[PDB]
Each structure stands twice: as structure tokens, then as C-alpha cells.
Amino acid sequence: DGENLRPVVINGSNVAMSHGNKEVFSCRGIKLAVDWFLERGHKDITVFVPAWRKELITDQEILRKLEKEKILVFTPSRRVRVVCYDDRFIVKLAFESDGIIVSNDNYRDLANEKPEWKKFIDERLLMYSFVNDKFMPPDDPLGRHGPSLDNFLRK
């Protein structure tokens, strides 16, 4: 009740994959997005990647530091392979933290589930594009009819 900037929650798996070669998990995509939000002034950032990424993937050592730095968490997975969907962990954290969800995933699945999540997703989803190492969020994140980038990123 004081931090005028919102928390940021990042779908790492989609970011990494949306960086570099479409099929390559280019970790470095996360840090770049984190450096977008750290220079803007955000202190609360969290990036959810499945645990198996620790164990077509480049720069895994990025996921070591961001984890130890309080920014990253490794969602559950194991063998039987089963991977608990990080999708829910992001939506629920961003919902309660009053933050944003950084993803090119529309989250139609979780929106369709319950009407509070559809409202929150459509109002607080921050989409993006990568051009090389240029993490460019739109300055019209809800299209034109919603807030600008600054307004969207702040309480």
C-alpha cells in the first residue's frame, strides 16, 4: 500500500521461446524483459519457468542467478514426463499481487474458466515483441481505448 508501480509476473517459457529461434529456449529473453522493468523502476518482479528447464536451450545459467536473486521460481515437473502448468501460477500471483502478466499467450483457457480472471487478464496482460535484443512493449497495451504504457504499469 505505497508502491505506485505494479508488480510484474513473467511467463518465462513463452518469453525465452519468443526470443531467438522460435523453437529455441533463449533464456536471455527473460533478463532483457527484467532489465526493461528494473530500469523503469519496478522492484517486484517474478518469472515462472518449469523446473525441468534447470535439468534446444541456450544460456541456462541465466536461470541460476534470477532464481537466487528473488526474481525467478521453478514450477513443478518430474517423470512418470508431467509438467504442472505455470499458466495458473502466473495468473494467481498477478491477480493477488495486483500486477501484470507478461506474455504473448492470450490466456483464453484461464479467462474462459472464471469471469474474474477474464476481466483481470484482458485488463492487465502486457504483450510484447522482440526485435533482436529489443524488448518493446506497446505504448497502447489494450489497444488505443485503454491506458498508455506508463498508466498501465502503475497503480
PDB file of N, CA and C in Angstrom, residues 30-42 45 126 134-137 139 149 153:
ATOM      1  N   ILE A  30      14.445 -13.513 -20.992  1.00  0.00           N
ATOM      2  CA  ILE A  30      13.923 -13.140 -19.664  1.00  0.00           C
ATOM      3  C   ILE A  30      14.652 -11.893 -19.113  1.00  0.00           C
ATOM      4  N   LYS A  31      15.940 -12.033 -18.776  1.00  0.00           N
ATOM      5  CA  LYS A  31      16.795 -10.912 -18.312  1.00  0.00           C
ATOM      6  C   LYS A  31      16.543  -9.589 -19.027  1.00  0.00           C
ATOM      7  N   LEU A  32      16.499  -9.626 -20.358  1.00  0.00           N
ATOM      8  CA  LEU A  32      16.163  -8.453 -21.167  1.00  0.00           C
ATOM      9  C   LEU A  32      14.824  -7.821 -20.745  1.00  0.00           C
ATOM     10  N   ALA A  33      13.789  -8.655 -20.603  1.00  0.00           N
ATOM     11  CA  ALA A  33      12.487  -8.204 -20.098  1.00  0.00           C
ATOM     12  C   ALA A  33      12.579  -7.722 -18.657  1.00  0.00           C
ATOM     13  N   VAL A  34      13.373  -8.403 -17.835  1.00  0.00           N
ATOM     14  CA  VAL A  34      13.621  -7.959 -16.456  1.00  0.00           C
ATOM     15  C   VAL A  34      14.327  -6.589 -16.453  1.00  0.00           C
ATOM     16  N   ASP A  35      15.339  -6.430 -17.306  1.00  0.00           N
ATOM     17  CA  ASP A  35      16.033  -5.141 -17.475  1.00  0.00           C
ATOM     18  C   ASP A  35      15.155  -4.030 -18.042  1.00  0.00           C
ATOM     19  N   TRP A  36      14.117  -4.400 -18.788  1.00  0.00           N
ATOM     20  CA  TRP A  36      13.087  -3.437 -19.163  1.00  0.00           C
ATOM     21  C   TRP A  36      12.344  -2.914 -17.929  1.00  0.00           C
ATOM     22  N   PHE A  37      11.957  -3.809 -17.020  1.00  0.00           N
ATOM     23  CA  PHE A  37      11.171  -3.448 -15.828  1.00  0.00           C
ATOM     24  C   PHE A  37      11.993  -2.917 -14.644  1.00  0.00           C
ATOM     25  N   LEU A  38      13.268  -3.300 -14.543  1.00  0.00           N
ATOM     26  CA  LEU A  38      14.151  -2.774 -13.488  1.00  0.00           C
ATOM     27  C   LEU A  38      14.568  -1.320 -13.740  1.00  0.00           C
ATOM     28  N   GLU A  39      14.870  -0.985 -14.995  1.00  0.00           N
ATOM     29  CA  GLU A  39      15.207   0.394 -15.384  1.00  0.00           C
ATOM     30  C   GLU A  39      14.012   1.346 -15.333  1.00  0.00           C
ATOM     31  N   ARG A  40      12.811   0.817 -15.570  1.00  0.00           N
ATOM     32  CA  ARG A  40      11.575   1.595 -15.414  1.00  0.00           C
ATOM     33  C   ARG A  40      11.283   1.940 -13.957  1.00  0.00           C
ATOM     34  N   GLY A  41      11.789   1.126 -13.031  1.00  0.00           N
ATOM     35  CA  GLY A  41      11.656   1.368 -11.593  1.00  0.00           C
ATOM     36  C   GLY A  41      10.960   0.286 -10.782  1.00  0.00           C
ATOM     37  N   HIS A  42      10.520  -0.802 -11.431  1.00  0.00           N
ATOM     38  CA  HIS A  42       9.814  -1.893 -10.748  1.00  0.00           C
ATOM     39  C   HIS A  42      10.800  -2.646  -9.877  1.00  0.00           C
ATOM     40  N   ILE A  45       9.381  -8.142  -9.279  1.00  0.00           N
ATOM     41  CA  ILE A  45       9.283  -8.948 -10.499  1.00  0.00           C
ATOM     42  C   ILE A  45       9.351 -10.431 -10.121  1.00  0.00           C
ATOM     43  N   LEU A 126       0.299  -7.753 -20.367  1.00  0.00           N
ATOM     44  CA  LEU A 126       1.266  -6.955 -21.139  1.00  0.00           C
ATOM     45  C   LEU A 126       1.928  -7.792 -22.234  1.00  0.00           C
ATOM     46  N   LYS A 134      15.808  -6.226 -28.394  1.00  0.00           N
ATOM     47  CA  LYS A 134      14.960  -5.056 -28.110  1.00  0.00           C
ATOM     48  C   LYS A 134      13.577  -5.516 -27.628  1.00  0.00           C
ATOM     49  N   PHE A 135      13.382  -5.504 -26.311  1.00  0.00           N
ATOM     50  CA  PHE A 135      12.108  -5.832 -25.660  1.00  0.00           C
ATOM     51  C   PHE A 135      11.237  -4.577 -25.724  1.00  0.00           C
ATOM     52  N   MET A 136      10.357  -4.540 -26.723  1.00  0.00           N
ATOM     53  CA  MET A 136       9.483  -3.401 -26.975  1.00  0.00           C
ATOM     54  C   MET A 136       8.032  -3.746 -26.591  1.00  0.00           C
ATOM     55  N   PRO A 137       7.593  -3.307 -25.395  1.00  0.00           N
ATOM     56  CA  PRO A 137       6.157  -3.351 -25.115  1.00  0.00           C
ATOM     57  C   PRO A 137       5.401  -2.255 -25.861  1.00  0.00           C
ATOM     58  N   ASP A 139       2.994   0.864 -26.438  1.00  0.00           N
ATOM     59  CA  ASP A 139       2.534   2.013 -25.651  1.00  0.00           C
ATOM     60  C   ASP A 139       1.011   2.170 -25.724  1.00  0.00           C
ATOM     61  N   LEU A 149       1.452   3.185 -21.815  1.00  0.00           N
ATOM     62  CA  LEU A 149       2.377   2.258 -21.151  1.00  0.00           C
ATOM     63  C   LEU A 149       2.622   2.639 -19.688  1.00  0.00           C
ATOM     64  N   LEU A 153       1.353   0.468 -16.386  1.00  0.00           N
ATOM     65  CA  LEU A 153       2.371  -0.082 -15.479  1.00  0.00           C
ATOM     66  C   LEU A 153       2.296   0.404 -14.023  1.00  0.00           C
TER      67      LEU A 153
END
